[PDB]
Amino acid sequence: ARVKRAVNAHKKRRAILEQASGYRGQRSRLYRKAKEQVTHSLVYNYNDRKKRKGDFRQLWIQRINAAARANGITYNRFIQGLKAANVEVDRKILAELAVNDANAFAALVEVAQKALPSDVNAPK
Amino acid sequence: MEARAQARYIRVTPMKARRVVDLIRGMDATEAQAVLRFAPQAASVPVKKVLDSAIANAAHNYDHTDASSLFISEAFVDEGPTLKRFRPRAQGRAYRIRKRTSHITVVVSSK
């Protein structure tokens, strides 16, 4: 019983080249060169997909810090004050207030400022 | 009013045929004959022979006798069956030579 390995082999070739539709040059026409690259595309997907969590937190701190400095409180201490008021609210949405609803973020810096100790550098 | 003709297995390499067919895209049919007429390239002879069938088909088959409202709608050259022969060269070796052919198509439509 001889088996011609054409109906079986093509099954993965089309799968890769469908994932490869889009690559520039020779990575989107040739199975071998396309299958070396969709391996790299998946590994980069994994890394960047797990590393956009810190990417977005970086973007939120930038916005929080920019808005906080508009109200004369550095991001260094605006967070500590928030901790000492137990009003923990995620950065995801704490930075969503600074952009749209300035008043709400302005109302939260007020709380964070009053929850700080009088002299912030004296021994705890 | 799309009417078209084409010559198949015309013995001229596709690139050499495209060199001339790329002149005659989108001009008046008669104005294209007057360009292939005074064209140095040797491919301009088969191409103009196909451009005349397209006009002849337009006049006869579809009854559009007036060949002055026509422009080249489509014109393209497709690859054809390549022939393969050898050439003796230095020190007993042999390099291949491909005699390429082409399929020339021309389409004339009413303006």
Partner: peptide, 24 residues
Amino acid sequence: AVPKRKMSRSNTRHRRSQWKAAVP
């Protein structure tokens, strides 16, 4: 000399565009 790599499709076509005939 010898070609070191197969010329990429972009680079090949950049050049052949220059091999065009002029309208008389």
